[PDB]
Design a protein around this ligand. Structure first.
Ligand SMILES: CCCCCCCCCCCCCCCCCC(=O)OC[C@H](COP(=O)(O)OCCN)OC(=O)CCCCCCCCCCCCCCCCC
Ligand SMILES: CCCCCCCCCCCCCCCCCC(=O)OC[C@H](COP(=O)(O)OCCN)OC(=O)CCCCCCCCCCCCCCCCC
Ligand SMILES: CCCCCCCCCCCCCCCCCC(=O)OC[C@H](COP(=O)(O)OCCN)OC(=O)CCCCCCCCCCCCCCCCC
Ligand SMILES: CCCCCCCCCCCCCCCCCC(=O)OC[C@H](COP(=O)(O)OCCN)OC(=O)CCCCCCCCCCCCCCCCC
Ligand SMILES: CCCCCCCCCCCCCCCCCC(=O)OC[C@H](COP(=O)(O)OCCN)OC(=O)CCCCCCCCCCCCCCCCC
Ligand SMILES: CCCCCCCCCCCCCCCCCC(=O)OC[C@H](COP(=O)(O)OCCN)OC(=O)CCCCCCCCCCCCCCCCC
Ligand SMILES: CCCCCCCCCCCC(=O)OC[C@H](COP(=O)(O)OCC[N+](C)(C)C)OC(=O)CCCCCCCCCCC
Ligand SMILES: CCCCCCCCCCCC(=O)OC[C@H](COP(=O)(O)OCC[N+](C)(C)C)OC(=O)CCCCCCCCCCC
Ligand SMILES: CCCCCCCCCCCC(=O)OC[C@H](COP(=O)(O)OCC[N+](C)(C)C)OC(=O)CCCCCCCCCCC
Ligand SMILES: CCCCCCCCCCCC(=O)OC[C@H](COP(=O)(O)OCC[N+](C)(C)C)OC(=O)CCCCCCCCCCC
Lengths: 64, 161, 205, 95, 78, 80, 60, 75, 506, 49
């Protein structure tokens, strides 16, 4: 009833609720929001590919 | 002194401080005019005139829509900006105007050699039409198809009936 | 004698001894730290201009609040990314190559350093829990061969003759070990003793 | 967006402050506080208060309700049930 | 060609309405024209800084490559 | 200045101002096509430039009609 | 047989910048709308054109 | 080939019988529907068998070339 | 046939008077047009002849056996979609009259079908830009066909703006390539595949990724699909993906020639993020169309892994997956349109407002479907289990074939992540099934005369009145049994996908 | 006549018209110019043969 729930249903439910609540705030009809994300993605073309894992770490920081 | 640099400097200043929708429909016209003039004086006078013939008709239709949708919102609203942050932003932007990093391609001047073989000498628009109406006639007929769809599309969107 | 444990690791090209010129860890971390701080700080002051241009429009304000970064995040993010780049290169130089353990250590420490800056108002054990989770993800990323195995894939092996296109034949026995993606009908018994060891039914009882 | 963000405690709190700026007998105003008895408003003072409470909350009392209002709590009930944010331009929401 | 006709009209009206904003914009415009005309090299050195920091082949980088080949080729003959 | 997305401050705060940005952005593609075609003395690039201008004008009309009808929907009571 | 058949079909031969499929059947520029003889830089002889690379049809 | 087309018609009977459950009618309602459904999938079944018979012929011809290609590789 | 018959229908629709019956009969004429288009296309295009790749119209178009299969799939799915507007979906006028109130509905579909079928064939950058505009404009006009609807117009505004930004990105990529090489034909550009900047083609793919709703550009498609009418959302959420993904496969086929692994890593980054968002995004949602929007984002990520690997096993994976996913998409939306007849009627908390465009808008409006219609509820369960990937349904072989191609190319991380993504997304797929059935016994003996279906009259009280119309019932029966019983013909179907070649030859 | 072949000023100075995925790559990403510098270097290296 302890660690196997934290690393199981109860723990993953809290993780899912936290992550899904973040994603629910990103779906709203707004021109400025989607334009910023489109233009931001252009940096993947500019950046050298070795920086992908740093962008991955930065994105996980923003989830918090 | 290339005075087109000054024109774009003023235009960039007015795009940062623009508040209402009428100023935006003026940023568009303040953009096509430098394009038309620079095309006229450097690269293509044909396309300088095509831009004027087509974009102006689009601009007036754009302007008439502003009249029907102007909604009092941004006349009385306030903006903060700051004169110092505007000019500093434009200064940093003006520092880097090298869109290309091939220094030799940007610094070394080139020439072309004329030949007399073309004795049938006609305008660029005649060759463009010659190819467009013969070899790329499919492209022209699809464009005609897309123009037809817009006619039907505009009616099924706007017409209440 | 050493224990004979299974080794579930995907194939990777192994640099010969004397190879692997190391990468300058401080220099590489400097580029990530400076470039990130310039962008994050620059995008911060760009968004303040968008604030000043309009604050009576709820639609713009809602979208700007999502992308807004706190002051401790504007400092913590470049530091965490810079420490990550430094520690990832520093450990890679130590081990003559990049390993999943090195990336796990580099990511968890970099996360904990950043978390202790922009997540000050949370319990210390909470920050360590996230750092262990973050470090495990990047260790798993390296263990799986980053985004693709590349020259170690089966398709690459099949193009180099190291696959199983020609089939198998029991009469052929090879002293050297088979390729990672290669299968054989019969093996030298010495290889089995090297893998399993003697004992519970190998050679002896 | 186009929904109310009003609570019963805020509407009461804003109602009390707007009623405090008038010449009332007592400054101790709650939901049960009557206009004629506790605060002491005649015909004209009451309608000055109603319009003042209209401007604060951007609501308009109907004629039937306004003529029959007795207590401060009735106003708080009316504001909570009838308040709507004003429609914005086609650009305020989507942009 | 319409910018040649409009430019006197826009410039004077720009100074009338916003004399300080116009003077700052026009002053900066003239300063860079003085940099180019009188070979102050300020804009070129900024360009050389941007290429060095972003990993582009600079003018000095391409000349160093030539000097490395030049020394390599001479020894190949001597 | 481009990488910090300075262009996001130059775009106005109306839906029509987004339309103007799209037209300007597409017009940048056509100017680049005309410039390359003229240097190469290639009429295929100029045919491409002409196609871009016509097509860019089509979407300008289609987008305008959507915005026109969007404004009509708000002014729908029309008791007059 | 089923294992053998899948090995043949699922094998992907390598492609690089030296071998790949280009679907062009003839050389352009035999005729132009006007001024076919330009600077005489067209050195391709259409009277003695060598045979082209005919595409392979596996079902033929 | 009758056995194959027999199954396809029986598939069409199943499709109609399942549809009757969707519409909540007795399975004996309008018995001609099974005949119509059975023939419609026999027609699809006959075309399907021609498609598969063609595919096996094409696969053999391609496999012969692929074996020659593999023999060169295995050297 | 499409172009010729479209002109007649355009003129004919404007000539006759406006009535719901006439619009419905004009829609049936559109059904006949697509059927004749399919018959003519089948009569002349065959897989064996098109294996080499045949140029048409001064090499502006290039059709091969890989392109041809997708064209026939597009025509077949478009046939199934037109049955929705050409026949009764529910049989009740308050719901069905919406599909007959717009006479230009069928015209826009025929306009878009032309754009859908020509897009995979593009062989020139000039025609690539023209066609991608033709497809996009028709989608905007279809999204705004109901112009008296506030949400429908708002979606079309969002669709136009985002899709114009992507088109500019696509145009900007082609202009850069023309600037580099001075060439417009794709096969000519292939001769210089080693010298042009390959990331100029990644910019071209980025604009295509926006138009398929890939992360991080997923936000607008999730918003648009939820706000649009269910009949509109059924089309726009599936049709653009059939053509654009096929075009992405052909572009990635050319990109793999130079083997740029940096480009492979950026795409893998977008696939990885889309799996995370597609699975975790749907966990906390209450709208069914919002849930299906994340399902679409997740299944696109699965297909893009096959497109990214881009090998012989990838052709089979992509071809099979796109066919079976289209049928599952069609089957689910057909059931959702039908089951609005079982909605309770008032005679209230949360002030829930339901409109005529989307009568089924929340997941819990599917409650007690196991009681109201057991056969339809099972049909919906089979489709949802197929999306989950329960064998031996079609959805299992789709994931199995995708994994084979992905793991064969060394994409160990993406293969593991998708299987974790499949498990996470199973949580919200199961929630549909929980709503359908889990309260059957505690509700079996209840009196439900307050349904929408109960408002319909009865003819004679001696006849048997079917509760669902003939055509829509047969389509649901056919597709559900195909999904269920694919094991019977799986071997023969996958042998056909072996023959579909994209310049393999030998 | 010898002339430069640079892009128009409006292309490389307009606040909005200068921003695109390929223009940022040409201006801020060295991936393209690294490859093309190899071609130029081969010209001088190959002189000796
Ligand atoms: C024959 C010459 C005609 C123009 C002479 C007048 C010069 C004024 C500026 C002309 C265009 C320069 C760039 C301006 C772009 C549009 C920005 C704008 O909003 O207009 C500027 C004008 C000044 O208003 P101001 O008080 O300074 O700022 C607002 C303070 N809250 O705010 C206004 O709304 C007034 C605008 C009046 C209508 C102008 C319509 C545009 C005409 C452009 C034709 C020339 C093309 C541009 C050439 C110069 C390029 C920089
Ligand atoms: C006169 C000065 C002119 C300045 C011009 C630049 C404008 C300011 C922008 C800040 C600098 C960032 C962009 C730098 C260029 C783009 C990256 C790049 O190309 O690499 C350059 C730099 C050095 O790397 P280098 O090895 O020298 O280049 C290859 C040489 N063969 O590589 C780097 O290390 C750059 C640092 C990048 C790492 C930080 C970015 C990741 C974290 C922030 C993420 C931003 C948001 C995420 C966007 C993606 C969203 C999906
Ligand atoms: C420079 C600007 C900032 C950079 C933005 C980058 C945008 C593109 C990157 C791709 C992510 C697309 C998702 C939508 C973009 C999110 C927009 C955004 O930045 O808003 C921040 C958002 C809100 O969070 P919140 O803290 O509540 O708001 C701030 C309050 N001041 O916080 C979020 O929820 C953002 C997280 C969204 C979920 C993305 C997760 C993607 C998968 C990452 C993990 C990959 C899984 C595999 C891991 C194993 C490998 C290690
Ligand atoms: C948050 C911190 C919690 C633990 C972080 C990881 C600790 C586990 C570990 O592996 O530590 C090792 C780490 C360096 O990792 P490593 O690459 O193995 O060092 C070179 C060996 N020749 O050594 C460390 O510095 C930690
Ligand atoms: C109407 C259905 C007709 C089916 C025709 C399928 C088809 O297009 O032919 C098979 C096709 C290969 O065709 P090909 O070899 O190139 O040309 C000569 C073949 N006679 O192979 C293909 O590429 C077809 C690809 C799409 C297959 C879709 C399968 C659809 C399943 C049946 C639809 C459901 C039917 C519901 C019934 C409702 C009507 C009442
Ligand atoms: C033997 C059985 C084995 C099977 C078990 C396998 C699962 C093992 C994983 C266990 C980890 C999850 C369980 C514990 C998580 C608990 C989440 C949580 O409590 O929220 C923490 C915090 C929010 O704070 P709050 O919850 O409100 O209060 C603090 C309570 N002390 O918010 C947080 O800090 C959460 C961290 C932010 C989200 C980080 C996201 C990282 C990337 C996603 C992780 C999964 C990656 C999957 C990638 C593919 C997805 C398709
Ligand atoms: C890989 C090694 C083998 C592991 C096999 C898979 C085990 C997964 C854990 C069980 C989850 C479960 O069962 O999901 C069911 C649970 C039910 O939760 P509940 O009891 O109703 O409490 C929840 C409600 N409360 C707290 C209010 C009472 O929903 C959840 O929590 C939702 C989160 C779903 C996350 C699923 C991700 C699965 C990833 C698997 C690989 C890491
Ligand atoms: C459970 C499986 C773990 C394997 C053990 C391992 O991989 O061990 C842990 C590794 C160590 O790898 P290392 O130290 O870099 O290499 C070892 C030394 N060498 C270079 C001589 C080989 O590190 C990690 O934390 C990686 C996280 C692995 C997570 C795997 C998830 C399960 C996927 C299931 C696949 C079917
Ligand atoms: C309420 C009812 C619940 C469920 C009951 C289940 C009843 C099952 C009835 C089966 C009838 C039967 O026997 O069909 C058999 C016939 C004849 O097979 P054949 O031509 O010899 O092929 C040989 C079969 N091998 C390979 C196993 C030897 O094929 C069929 O018709 C196939 C069934 C159609 C399945 C859908 C996939 C094919 C369409 C392709 C479109 C992409
Ligand atoms: C050459 C092979 C095919 C031959 C037949 C095909 C056309 C059949 C039309 C007959 C007339 C008709 O359908 O009449 C209408 C009937 C009855 O409708 P009901 O629901 O009982 O209405 C009640 C009618 N009352 C009130 C008079 C009682 O519908 C049917 O029976 C439906 C069966 C349709 C079969 C579709 C097959 C699709 C195969 C798809 C493969 C990809």
């Amino acid at each position: 009833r302890g660690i196997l729930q934290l690393f199981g249903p109860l723990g993953l439910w809290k993780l899912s609720t936290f992550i899904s609540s973040k994603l629910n705030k990103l779906v709203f009809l707004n021109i400025g929001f989607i334009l910023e994300i489109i233009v931001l993605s252009w940096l993947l073309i500019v950046f050298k590919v070795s920086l992908l894992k740093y962008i991955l770490l930065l994105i996980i920081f923003i989830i918090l | 002194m290339n005075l087109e640099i000054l024109d774009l400097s003023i235009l960039g200043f007015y795009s940062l401080i623009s508040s209402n929708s009428f100023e935006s429909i003026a940023i568009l016209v303040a953009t096509i005019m430098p394009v038309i003039t620079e095309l006229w004086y450097n690269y293509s006078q044909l396309f300088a005139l095509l831009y004027t013939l087509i974009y102006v008709g689009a601009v007036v239709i754009l302007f008439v829509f502003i009249l029907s949708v102007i909604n009092e919102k941004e006349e009385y609203e306030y903006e903060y900006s700051g004169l110092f942050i505007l000019i500093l932003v434009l200064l940093l932007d003006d520092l880097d105007d090298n869109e290309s990093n091939d220094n030799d391609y940007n610094n070394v001047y080139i020439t072309d050699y004329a030949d007399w073989f073309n004795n049938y000498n006609e305008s660029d628009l005649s060759v463009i039409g010659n190819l467009l109406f013969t070899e790329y006639a499919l492209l022209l007929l699809i464009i005609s198809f897309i123009l037809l769809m817009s006619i039907i599309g505009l009616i099924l969107i706007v017409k209440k009936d | 004698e050493q224990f004979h444990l299974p080794q579930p690791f995907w194939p990777t090209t192994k640099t010969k001894e004397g190879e692997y010129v190391p990468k300058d860890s401080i220099r590489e971390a400097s580029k990530v730290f400076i470039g990130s701080g310039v962008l994050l700080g620059g995008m911060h002051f760009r968004r303040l201009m968008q604030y000043k241009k309009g604050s009576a429009r709820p639609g713009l304000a809602k979208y700007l609040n999502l992308f807004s970064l706190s002051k401790s995040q504007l400092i913590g993010f470049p530091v965490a990314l810079g420490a990550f780049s430094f520690l990832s290169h520093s450990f890679a130089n130590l081990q003559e190559g990049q390993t999943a353990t090195g990336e796990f250590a580099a990511s968890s420490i970099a996360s904990l350093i950043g978390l202790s800056i922009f997540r000050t108002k949370k319990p210390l054990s909470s920050n360590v829990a996230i750092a262990v989770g973050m470090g495990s993800l990047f260790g798993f990323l390296t263990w799986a061969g980053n985004f693709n195995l590349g020259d170690n894939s089966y398709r690459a092996a099949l193009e180099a003759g190291n696959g199983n296109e020609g089939g198998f034949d029991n009469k052929v026995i090879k002293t050297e070990r088979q390729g990672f993606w290669e299968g054989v009908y019969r093996r030298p018994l010495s290889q089995t003793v090297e893998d399993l060891g003697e004992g519970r039914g190998i050679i002896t009882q | 967006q186009s929904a109310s963000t009003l609570t019963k405690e805020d509407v009461l709190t804003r109602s009390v402050s707007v009623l405090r700026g008038f010449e009332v007998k007592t400054k101790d105003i709650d939901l049960q506080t009557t206009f004629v008895q506790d605060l002491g408003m005649d015909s004209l003072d009451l309608n000055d208060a109603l319009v003042a409470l209209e401007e604060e909350f951007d609501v308009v009392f109907d004629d039937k309700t306004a003529n029959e209002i007795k207590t401060v709590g009735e106003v708080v009930d009316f504001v909570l049930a009838n308040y709507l944010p004003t429609e914005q331009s086609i650009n305020h929401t989507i942009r | 060609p319409y910018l040649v006709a409009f430019r006197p009209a826009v410039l004077v009206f720009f100074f009338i309405r916003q004399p300080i904003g116009a003077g700052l914009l026009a002053g900066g415009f003239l300063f860079w024209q003085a940099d180019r005309h009188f070979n102050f090299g300020i804009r070129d050195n900024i360009h050389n800084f941007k290429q060095t920091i972003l990993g582009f082949p600079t003018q000095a980088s391409k000349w160093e490559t030539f000097k490395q080949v030049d020394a390599q080729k001479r020894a190949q003959l001597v | 200045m481009d990488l910090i997305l300075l262009m996001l401050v130059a775009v106005g705060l109306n839906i029509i101002d987004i339309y103007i940005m799209i037209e300007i952005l597409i017009m940048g593609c056509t100017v680049n096509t005309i410039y390359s075609a003229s240097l190469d003395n290639d009429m295929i690039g100029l045919i491409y430039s002409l196609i871009q201008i016509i097509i860019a004008g089509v979407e300008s009309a289609i987008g305008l009609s959507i915005l026109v009808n969007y404004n009509r929907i708000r002014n729908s009571e029309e008791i007059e | 047989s089923t294992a053998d058949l899948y090995g043949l079909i699922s094998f992907t031969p390598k492609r690089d910048i030296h071998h790949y499929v280009i679907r062009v059947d003839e050389v352009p520029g035999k005729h132009f709308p006007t001024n076919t003889t330009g600077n005489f830089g067209n050195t391709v002889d259409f009277e003695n054109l060598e045979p082209r690379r005919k595409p392979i049809n596996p079902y033929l | 080939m009758i056995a194959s087309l027999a199954g396809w018609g029986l598939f069409g009977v199943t499709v109609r019988a399942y549809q009757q459950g969707i519409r909540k009618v007795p399975f004996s309602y309008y018995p001609l529907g099974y005949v119509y459904s059975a023939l419609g999938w026999v027609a699809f079944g006959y075309g399907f068998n021609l498609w598969t018979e063609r595919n096996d012929k094409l696969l053999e011809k391609r496999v012969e070339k692929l074996k020659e290609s593999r023999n060169l590789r295995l050297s | 046939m499409l172009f010729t018959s479209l002109l007649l229908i355009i003129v004919y629709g404007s000539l006759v008077n406006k009535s719901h019956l006439l619009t419905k009969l004009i829609n049936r004429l559109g059904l006949i047009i697509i059927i004749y288009t399919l018959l003519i296309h089948l009569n002349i295009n065959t897989l064996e002849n098109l294996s080499i790749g045949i140029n048409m119209f001064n090499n502006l178009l290039l059709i091969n056996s890989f392109n041809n299969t997708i064209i026939e799939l597009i025509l077949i799915i478009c046939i199934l979609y037109v049955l929705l507007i050409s026949f009764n979906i529910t049989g009740l006028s308050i719901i069905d009259n919406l599909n007959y109130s717009k006479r230009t509905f069928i015209v826009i579909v025929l306009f878009n079908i032309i754009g859908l079928t020509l897009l995979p064939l593009v062989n020139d950058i000039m025609i690539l830009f023209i066609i991608i505009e033709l497809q996009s404009y028709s989608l905007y006009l279809l999204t705004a066909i109901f112009n008296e609807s506030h949400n429908s117009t708002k979606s079309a505004l969002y669709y136009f703006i985002v899709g114009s930004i992507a088109s500019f990105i696509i145009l900007d990529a082609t202009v850069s390539i023309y600037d580099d090489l001075g060439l417009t034909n794709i096969q000519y550009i292939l001769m210089y595949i080693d010298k042009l900047e390959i990331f100029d083609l990644l910019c071209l793919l980025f604009g295509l990724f926006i138009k398929i709703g890939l992360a991080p550009f997923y936000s607008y498609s999730i918003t648009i699909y939820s706000l649009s009418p269910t009949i509109i959302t059924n089309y726009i959420s599936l049709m653009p993906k059939l053509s654009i993904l096929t075009l992405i496969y052909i572009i990635m086929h050319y990109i793999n020639i130079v083997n740029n692994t940096d480009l492979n890593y950026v795409i893998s980054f977008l696939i990885l993020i889309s799996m995370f968002i597609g699975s975790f995004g749907g966990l906390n949602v209450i709208r069914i169309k919002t849930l299906l929007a994340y399902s679409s984002l997740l299944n696109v990520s699965y297909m893009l892994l096959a497109i990214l690997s881009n090998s012989n096993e990838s052709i089979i994976a992509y071809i099979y997956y796109i066919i079976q996913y289209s049928l599952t998409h069609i089957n689910i939306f057909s059931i959702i349109l039908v089951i609005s007849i079982y909605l309770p009627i008032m005679n209230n908390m949360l002030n829930v407002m339901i409109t005529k465009y989307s009568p089924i808008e929340y997941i819990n409006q599917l409650k007690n479907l196991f009681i109201n219609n057991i056969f339809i509820a099972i049909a919906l369960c089979i489709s949802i289990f197929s999306l989950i990937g329960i064998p031996p349904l079609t959805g299992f072989y789709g994931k199995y074939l995708v994994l084979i191609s992905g793991l064969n190319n060394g994409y160990v991380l993406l293969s593991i992540v998708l299987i974790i993504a499949s498990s996470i997304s199973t949580v919200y797929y199961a929630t549909i099934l929980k709503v359908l059935s889990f309260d059957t016994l505690s509700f079996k003996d209840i009196i439900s005369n307050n349904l929408i279906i109960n408002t319909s009259p009865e003819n004679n009280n001696n006849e048997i009145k079917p509760e669902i119309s003939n055509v829509i019932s047969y389509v649901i029966s056919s597709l559900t049994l195909i999904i269920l019983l694919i094991i019977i013909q799986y071997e023969n179907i996958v042998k056909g996908a072996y023959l579909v070649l994209l310049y393999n030859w030998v | 006549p010898y002339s430069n072949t640079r892009r128009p000023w409006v292309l490389r100075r307009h606040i909005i018209m200068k921003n695109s995925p390929t223009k940022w790559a040409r201006k801020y990403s060295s991936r393209r110019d690294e490859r093309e510098q190899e071609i130029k270097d081969d010209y001088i290296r190959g002189m000796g043969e």
